[PDB]
């Protein structure tokens, strides 16, 4: 609802991802990103919902 903004990590998120490349473009579709109340990236789970 609305225009939420938030960031979360999906449960399978590899620790060594945030370091390397592909940071803002996750191969695994981990790294949940909500902008303007839109789901841009990431799978949802207990960590986000």
């Amino acid at each position: 609802p609305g225009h939420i903004n938030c960031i979360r990590t999906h449960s399978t998120h590899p620790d060594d991802e945030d370091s390397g490349p592909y940071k803002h473009i996750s191969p695994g579709d981990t790294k949940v990103v909500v902008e303007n109340g839109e789901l841009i990236m990431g799978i949802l789970c207990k960590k986000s919902l």
């Binding site: 225009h3 903004n5 938030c6 303007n36």
Partner: protein, 198 residues
């Protein structure tokens, strides 16, 4: 084992919960904004030492805690000397106001001295270097909310006078009142109660 512990855990914990409630049933937040009991005896001067409810607060990060005495400076200092870097950030008619005005430059330097003192405060508050803290307003999401509402585009130079921030924060600090009053004893406590959020 699990079945055993279950059956015993139900009998003991339920009595501990009862005793808790009975030793703190009448504890409440009076209109004084003070935490008293049945006898009117003052428990806490402010609820939770901070005057703020349990529902609205969130986990956040202290930025000025645990950087180092040089990464802190080149990140919270606002140099007004580098002429090339301020035309990147600020528009053309703000980079002269900070490159000539000696009032604006003393003001910006005085603010950093305040942050450097707040930094030592933080380090006697939070030894062990624990960035994580619980506070009312999620600043970083508010900022982000601001970026998405007004369509910021963080790649153009901004028109926000570096002094409107310094003085708007000073005027904002005023409006966040927990302990009302002008008394020195009241100002001190107001200052105290809102120290971490400030």
């Amino acid at each position: 084992e699990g079945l055993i512990d279950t059956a015993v855990k139900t009998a003991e914990t339920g009595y501990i919960q009862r005793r808790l409630i009975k030793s703190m049933e009448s504890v409440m937040v009076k209109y004084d904004a003070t935490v008293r009991n049945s006898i009117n005896q003052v428990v806490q001067l402010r609820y939770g030492e901070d005057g703020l409810a349990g529902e609205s607060v969130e986990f956040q990060n202290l930025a000025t805690l645990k950087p180092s005495n040089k990464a802190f400076e080149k990140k919270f200092r606002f140099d007004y000397t580098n002429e090339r870097a301020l035309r990147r950030t600020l528009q053309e008619d703000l980079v002269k106001d900070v490159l000539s005005n000696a009032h604006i430059q003393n003001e910006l330097e005085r603010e950093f001295e305040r942050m450097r003192e707040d930094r030592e405060v933080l380090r006697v508050i939070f030894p062990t270097g624990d960035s994580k803290v619980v506070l009312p307003c999620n600043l970083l999401r508010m900022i982000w909310n601001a970026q998405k509402i007004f369509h910021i585009n963080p790649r153009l130079p901004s028109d926000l006078h570096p002094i409107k921030v310094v003085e708007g924060v000073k005027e904002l600090s005023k409006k966040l009142v927990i302990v009302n009053g002008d008394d020195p004893l009241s100002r001190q406590a107001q200052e105290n109660a809102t120290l971490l959020f400030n």
